[PDB]
Each structure stands twice: as structure tokens, then as C-alpha cells.
């Protein structure tokens, strides 16, 4: 690592971004009308990484007004549909790159979701893909650009996960999943922001400033894949890759009203990502796609898994990506863990999705009760930072300040002795086994297991900054390693989502979240998403049920 | 844990065994002819756990002479063929139990492979299985008894993995894999011996004494599943369950000339077994069957997996047990790791198997080179005993002496700090990734991967006592977690397997093993086995190739 003063390093980070932003504008080739509107947009980028600017109230509305038909006709197109145009040559690989580059630039200024553009290598990828049209026409993602979280290695770049001390950590390789996607006709064109330590459900770092929600600029984008949620919520990327060890894929997707899949560990390669606590295996992160488009989520998983990634990454299981043949479904609704109750907008989403499933004949819908959700915090309290956060704190030798959200994640971290880790590994495996028995207790008399559970992603829609003080609605499924797909349902409705009256809080933490929901106007136009949870390796059931819920 | 003096605790173990031996003889109901011959057999059981008796030179020969046709006509029958007789009711469950109980008693005396007989519960299992003949006739293992390593939990028994201090650790439940087998018509009838710490390729403990080879009583049975290898090598059980973290299933199976499957981690449940270092996850043990019968190995795997064990044990992958469709095969021959060369009998087995595969049109045979086998010892040297052997050494507070083989396994153990474990976890995962690339380097121009590798299980046939000082030929595949099937080839031939003349040792350890092989007469009648190695989750390819090699 580095030991220079952090203010100098933040400058170096800003320079890298500004250097890539300059090259991107050249690639995008604005006409004067757009250059004018772009110049006049409210920015979530400040003068320094501690200055958070003055973001728009509805960044997405500003985005749709600012960008021309020449761009939106491509970036607003569903990526699976756009792949048809790229295949039939109604649109060029370079043409698509130019539009999405322009979109990401406008998205970058409005939400601060881009850490580094990749226009040099992206133009080379897109140019040769056009030249090779006849031989690569058949590839399943031919011509499609995509975004990658900054923690994902890309050739010749620093990989820092937001820590300034790692700005000299250059890799000469791509992540396995990136090379696989390139082998299938795609290419990365932008690197998205990630926060300090990665262990916050928001997106603040001293490498980029603060990332904000795509639908309401006063709220967080979520985290840790906050850039990914914002960029793909603005539909300025066809899809992106994030990571999820505590909700870091599903929380951004839910806050920005798009799809995000925490895929089951052992399906797609993620270990070559960079994070804190490298070599820690007690609790493992997973990767997975975020996209505006469910069909795009499904196609990336299918494309990656059909490339047989277990022949490059031996931690992976050779299990085909297969659409389920189920005609009937048994589904549970997780109304609350009875520790922190959901805010009205989430509560209405649960009823909406419940009533829709009941209206289809082939769904049996039951209430799903929690199982010792307090044990999630206790076990993850010992295993997230099992070295007592020594590795993370060493990143602060530059003088880099400790963010308030990071404080929550590392407070109480013990430096575990080997026997302490063994104790909590046994606690971890026992809880997983107990929870499976809980899930199977919902099997019916004929032996039909629960296919999926519908649950909140968070006790609320996109949070106000520095208030993501409860993780269980996402970290529960990291402790269990269950596949979870966040999906859209509705938006805040000011008539329907007034605060609960005569509410009696369940505890101090529940009271905090109740008071956080002061009125729906504080979360105007914020998406209310939910998630589908399945047993391990049932990812595809979740996609199929999400398909039905959106038709 | 207990802290009484070990001499009485070994006493309590002997009485527990002797009380069950008394009950087994009552159940078996010897005729006077067998009772006389049994009384006069040379015993490998001594008066105390430090007296190793004086075993027969060829225990299997003495076993076949001692037992009547009334027993052998059942115990010598292939278990899959015996299942037809149990299903068609040509033989009762109780008849099969009595015969195999008798066989195991004779095997117990000759090889010292039995820790505790289970005749009370076995008679109840067999009786009610006969009573329920009409409703349970259909089960895939109806009426078949099987043996279990002592480390495997069974209702009402102590589970000690050979350590006297755990004699008061009684469980009120069976292992999941045991309950699955009982649900499919099988039942356990005997618990087999295991050694101290479980970390030796032999089978000596202060709970049972010394277990010897079924074919040559001067040699070890192997370990850690020494009882299982001996009991099933004598064909005194239809099959058994062992465990394998350093070769502890394949070494007994190979030394005793039978089949043994180190199944891929995550296919069949094993975590509820008892060992040292509970909660250690850096290197995980696996389970799997040992049997004289390849068809019985395959049927047990099929049976357990078709019970969907991932619905009780959430570490498992829902990957069906399916026979491969392959019509052509690519197979590599691993003649040596160029650290310890195999002895003449193993080298001859390699030639026999190579020429047999070549005489079939559909096998392409290539030489398979090692990839940094020295790294196996380095990494496992740090991760096998991650606490500096504190957990194991605490078992010796009873005064239980440290055996010489156990000494080797714990010498140099560091009490790893979290960062030290992280370093070696990264070394482990990097080595796995490097090795996969090495394996894939054998793919041919047409894109056909290597289907399997044929390798030694050990530098030699069944070793002389206290000489199992090299593990890599088995531990290589525990570090990589590759499925490995030990299988029979040939026996020592004193004319063909004379020592190499003018041999030049590769190093000090290779010199030791060369000098260990003084002449074939020291290993008279010893089976020369090899093993089939596959990539993760390709277990079934190994069964199909072994099927072809045995036809």
C-alpha cells in the first residue's frame, strides 16, 4: 500500500476520473446543444471528495430531458432487443458505444456513479467487433457494453475498492467473468464507484465523493455497488457487475428500481475481485448482474454459466442454467422479521405482489415467519471482520478519515483466535442447517417445497444518507448464501404511503426507522422494490417468478 | 472432555468392545465346528490396547478356511446380487444379518478392525425389515447391513475418533448419511476402528490397539478408515462409510484391494461426523463408501444423492448422480510425482492399466506430469492443524501417549493468526486455480478435456508399520478436492516385482521408500491398487472407467 497524505491521493483519484471524463466526452462527440445542457446540469460531483455538490431532485427526469433522441433511442431500448439490432446490423457496435458513453457521462454528473471511464479500450473493443461482424455475429452478447464495479480487476488499472492507499495497486489482467463476457461479444466501458471498506449500504468514499439515487437526489444510491445501482437505474448501462456480501447488489438495485441478482455462491466466478480481508473465507461475497432489464439479467447468467466457468475457476459447480419446468408454485410472503417493521411503501409492495400471485391460479401463497434473525447480526458480527478490522484500519495510515457508515461496520470487531473462528463457523453452519429445517417446515402434505419467499430488501425505500443502520433484510441471505433477486414493484405514492398512525415501535432500532419515515414526500418518486429468495442453486426459479410478476 | 488416567479409559473401551463381542457371538449362533476353529485363530487383538497380538500371515486365507459355507455363500456374494435375493425373499434380512455378523466377528479377531458391534439394534432393524417385507421390498438397499467408522454418530454411542478423553461424548442421533441409508432399507451393524487424531495413514489407537491388513498381517490396514478397509477387504461387510481428509478412504481401500471413493466435497453429507479441529473449514474432509464391489459403491452414491440430501444439509449441491454419456475417453497416466517414485508393484499396475485402456479403441492415453507437488505439503502443513495442534494435544491430558505417526502429523503446526490463515487460504485457492489450468493444458486440438487421471494411491502397496511418511499421492487431491476412486488391479508377484537394481534415489525421502521395499517377500499377497482421479463433480466418470477396467 501507500503512505502519502490522503489529500494528495484524493487529487490523484480525481485526476484519473477527470482524465477519463475528458476522453469520454471526445468519444461521445456532443453536439453543441447537448454540450450546453450538460454544462448546465446540477452536479453531484463537488470541488473535492468531501464536497458532495448539489444534486438534482429527480436526476432521471433531468437525464431524459438532457439527452437527445439520438442517444435515448438506443440506451432506453431493452438490451435483449438491442442485441437483435446489433446482430442484424441495423446499428453499429461503435454507434451503441457512443450512445452509452454519452449516457454514462450525463449519468455521472447527475448521480456521481462513475469512477473511471474506459473509452480508449472500449473504442478498440467496439471497432474490432464491427470489423469481425461476420465471425462474431453469433455470440450471445455481441456488441453490448457493460459497466463493472471498481473492485473488479481490469487490465492496467488500479483496484482500490475506494481506499486511497491502493492507488498504486495495478493489475495486468481482467477478472475471470470479464474475460468470459468478452469471449461472448461484450466489453466493459465504464468503472462504477464503490464506498470505503465496501461495508456500507451507501456509496461514499474518498476516491469519488458521494453517489446519490437515480430517482431522488436527496437519497442514497445504496451500496456497496452504489455506482452500479445509480448508473443502471439511469439506464446508462445495459447491465453491470457488482458484489454482494451484505446486500451490496440487492440494496442498490432495490433503491434504484431495477433488477439485481445475488447469485448462489459457486455459480459464477468472483474470487478474483479485490476487497478488504483478502483470504477471509468464513463469509464469502458473491457477484451477479444488475440491470434495468430482467431479460438481460437472465441472459448474462445463461451466457456466463454456459461458458463452463468451472474450467477456469475450480470453486464453481457444473450446474446448468436451466429454466424451471414447474407449472405450480408455492410462495411465502415475509412480512417482517419482527425486529424492524417495513415502512408503508414496502408494506404496500408486499400486498400488491401478494394479491397478484393470489390472482393467478397456480400460486399457493403462505405467510413466512422469521427464524432467529437476531443470530444473523451475532454471527456476522464476528465473521465479517474476523481480524478485528486490522486489515481495513491499515488503509487509514494515509490519514484517510473514517466515514460514519464505516464506523458501524467495524465497531465491535474482534481479532478472533483460531478457536474463536471455529466456534463461530460451527454457529454459522448450525444456523444454516436450522434455517433449512425452518424453510422445509413449510412443505405441504403432498411434499411440495416452498419454491421462493418474497421479502423486503430493506426496511424502507432508498434511505436518507447515513441512516442504513440495519442490514438483516439483506445480510440474512449472505449468512445463508441463498440466491436473492431484487425486483421492482411500485413507487412511493403520497396518498397511499402516509406514515402509520398510532404506531407502537418494537424496540429502539425500530423506533429509529419509524421516525426516519417522516412523510412520503421525503422519499418522493423513490422506487419500492422487493426481492425473491430461493433455496441454494434455485436462482432460475426466482427469475421465472419475477417474469410472471412483471407481465 | 475427560481427564481421568488413560489406562482405565482404555479399560472402559475394551469392556464396551468385549460386551458387544459377547452379544455378537450370541446373535451369530456359531455351530460347534466354527466355535472351535474361531477359538483357535491367531488374534490381532491383545490383552490391552498396547499389546498388538500376533496376527496371521494371511488373514483372508484363515478367514475363508474358518467360516462355514452357510456364512460365506452370503458374505462372498456381490451385495447388489444379494439385494436380488433379499428382494425376491430367497433370503431373509435376519439371515443376512446373522451371516455378516459372524463374518465380522472372525474378521475382528484376525485383523482387529472392529471397535464395537451393534447386534441389539441390528436385530431390531433386520426383524422389522422382514416384517415390513411387502411395503419395503422396493427400497434400493432393502435388507443390507453396512459398517460405519467409529467417528460417525450413532444413537446412544460415544463418538471419540479414537481419543479416550471423549468416551463420555454420547450422541442421541445418527449421522444424516446414516439416516438416509436407513430410510432406503439399509442399517448399520458394526462400528469400525479409527486411529488417534485421525491423521495417520495407519490405524493405531488407545481405544482398540492395532489394525492389520486383510491380505498380509505384517502390514498396516491403512488409515484413517483402517477398520473399514480391513473389514471390507475381508468381505465381512457389504460396504462401509469412512472419511477422507488426507487419503483416509482411499489408502485403506487400496491397501486391502477393494474400492474406495473420495467423493467430491458437497455431494454427500459428512459434516456431522466427529474429528479433531471442529469448526475448521480451511481444508474439509469428505465421506464415501468402501466396498469389495464397485457396483455397491455406485449404488450407495446413487441412493444417498437421489434422497436429495441438500434438503437436510445445506452445504450440498443439487447435482444428480448420473452415469456419463461418454463414448470416447481421454485418460492421463500419472507415473510419478518425481518426489517419491512408486515401488515395482505399483509401477506394474500402471502398465497393466495403460495397456488395457489402449487395447480398447475408444481410449486415448497420455502421460500426466505433476504440477508443484511440493506445494501440497507446504500448504497442508499450515492448514491441517490451524491451531498449532492445541485441540488434539488437549486430548492427551488423560496421559494418553502420543503415537509416532501422530507425531509426524502435528510436527511444525503453527497457531495461525487470522492474517496467517488468510495468506494460506490464498495459497490454497491459487494452487487450485493453477492446477486446473495445468489439467486443462491436456485438452486436445478438438477441445476434449481429460476425463480422468490414473495415479498411485501410495508409493507402494500396504506399508510396513510406522512407515507411512509420505502423503502427497492422496493428500494432493484433498487440497484440490478432486473426486478420487481407488480400485483394484493386481497383487504382488515375487518374480515380476523384484526391487529395481542400480536405482538412483531422487532425494532422502525417496531413498527411505526405496529401502523400505527390500523385496516382494516382505509384502506377500499384498494388493496393488491404483486410483482414478477426476475434476470436481465428475465422480460418475470415475465409476464408469473403473467398470471398464474391471470387465
TrEMBL record, chains A, B:
GO molecular function, one term: hydrolase activity
Matches recorded under Gene3D superfamilies: Amidase signature (AS) domain (3.90.1300.10)
Keywords, sorted A to Z: Hydrolase
Domain Amidase: 95-542
Binding, substrate: 198, 224, 245-248
Domain of life: Eukaryota
Residues the record marks as active site: 149 (charge relay system), 224 (charge relay system), 248 (acyl-ester intermediate)
Pfam families found in the cross-reference section: Amidase (PF01425)
Protein's UniProt keywords contain Plastid: no
Keyword Glycoprotein on entry: no
Family (UniProt): Belongs to the amidase family.
Protein name: Amidase family protein
Amino acid at each position: 500500500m501507500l503512505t502519502d497524505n490522503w489529500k494528495e491521493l484524493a487529487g490523484k483519484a480525481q485526476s484519473t476520473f477527470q482524465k477519463s471524463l475528458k476522453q469520454a466526452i471526445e468519444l461521445a462527440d456532443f453536439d453543441e446543444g447537448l454540450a450546453k445542457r450538460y454544462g448546465a446540469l446540477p452536479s453531484a460531483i463537488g470541488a473535492n471528495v468531501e464536497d458532495f455538490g448539489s444534486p438534482a431532485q429527480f436526476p432521471l427526469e433531468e437525464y431524459l430531458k438532457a439527452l437527445p433522441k439520438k442517444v435515448l433511442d438506443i440506451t432506453e431500448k431493452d438490451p435483449v432487443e438491442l442485441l437483435k439490432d446489433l446482430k442484424s446490423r441495423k446499428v453499429t457496435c461503435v454507434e451503441v458505444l457512443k450512445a452509452y458513453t454519452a449516457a454514462s457521462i450525463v449519468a455521472s454528473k447527475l448521480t456521481n456513479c462513475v469512477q473511471e471511464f474506459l473509452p480508449i479500450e472500449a473504442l478498440q473493443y467496439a471497432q474490432k467487433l464491427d470489423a469481425d461482424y461476420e465471425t462474431k455475429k453469433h455470440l450471445p452478447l455481441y456488441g453490448l457494453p457493460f459497466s463493472i464495479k471498481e473492485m473488479i480487476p481490469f487490465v492496467g488499472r488500479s483496484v482500490t475498492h475506494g481506499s486511497l492507499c491502493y492507488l498504486d495497486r495495478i493489475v495486468d489482467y481482467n477478472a475471470d467473468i470479464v474475460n468470459i463476457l468478452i469471449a461472448n461479444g461484450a466489453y466493459p466501458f465504464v468503472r462504477t464507484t464503490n464506498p470505503q471498506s465496501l461495508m456500507m449500504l451507501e456509496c461514499v468514499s474518498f476516491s469519488h465523493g458521494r453517489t446519490v439515487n437515480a430517482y431522488n437526489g436527496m437519497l442514497t444510491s445504496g451500496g456497496s455497488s452504489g455506482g452500479e445501482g445509480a448508473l443502471n437505474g439511469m439506464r446508462a448501462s445495459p447491465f453491470g457487475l457488482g458484489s454482494d456480501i451484505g446486500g451490496s447488489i440487492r440494496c442498490p438495485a432495490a433503491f434504484n428500481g431495477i433488477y439485481g441478482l445475488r447469485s448462489t455462491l459457486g455459480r459464477i466466478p468472483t474470487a478474483d475481485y479485490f476487497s478488504c480481508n483478502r483470504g477471509s473465507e468464513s463469509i464469502l461475497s458473491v457477484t451477479g448482474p444488475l440491470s434495468r432489464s430482467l431479460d438481460t439479467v437472465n441472459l448474462v447468467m445463461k451466457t456466463v454459466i454456459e461458458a463452463k466457468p468451472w474450467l477456469i475457476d475450480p470453486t464453481l459447480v457444473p450446474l446448468d442454467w436451466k429454466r424451471p419446468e414447474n407449472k405450480k408454485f408455492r410462495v411465502g410472503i415475509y412480512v417482517s422479521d419482527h425486529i424492524v417493521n417495513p415502512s408503508p411503501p414496502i408494506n404496500r409492495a408486499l400486498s400488491m405482489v401478494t394479491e397478484k400471485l393470489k390472482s393467478l391460479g397456480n400460486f399457493e401463497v403462505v405467510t413466512f415467519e422469521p427464524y432467529k434473525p437476531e443470530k444473523v447480526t451475532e454471527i456476522l458480527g464476528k465473521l465479517y471482520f474476523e481480524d478485528g478490522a486490522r486489515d481495513f484500519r491499515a488503509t487509514l495510515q494515509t490519514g484517510e478519515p473514517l466515514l460514519e457508515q464505516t464506523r458501524w461496520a467495524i465497531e465491535g470487531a474482534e481479532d478472533l483466535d483460531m478457536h474463536d473462528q471455529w466456534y463461530w463457523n460451527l454457529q454459522k453452519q448450525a444456523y444454516r442447517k436450522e434455517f433449512l429445517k425452518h424453510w422445509c417446515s413449510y412443505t405441504d402434505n403432498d411434499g411440495n417445497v416452498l419454491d421462493a419467499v418474497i421479502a423486503p430488501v430493506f426496511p424502507n425505500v432508498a434511505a436518507k444518507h447515513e441512516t442504513t443502520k440495519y442490514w438483516t433484510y439483506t445480510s440474512q441471505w449472505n449468512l445463508l448464501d441463498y440466491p436473492v433477486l431484487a425486483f421492482p414493484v411500485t413507487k412511493v405514492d403520497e396518498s397511499l404511503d402516509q406514515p402509520y398512525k398510532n404506531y407502537k415501535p418494537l424496540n429502539d432500532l425500530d423506533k429509529y426507522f419509524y421516525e426516519q419515515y417522516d412523510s412520503p414526500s421525503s422519499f418522493k418518486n423513490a422506487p419500492a422494490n422487493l426481492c425473491l429468495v430461493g433455496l441454494r442453486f434455485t436462482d432460475e426459479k426466482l427469475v421465472e417468478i419475477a417474469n410472471i410478476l412483471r407481465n
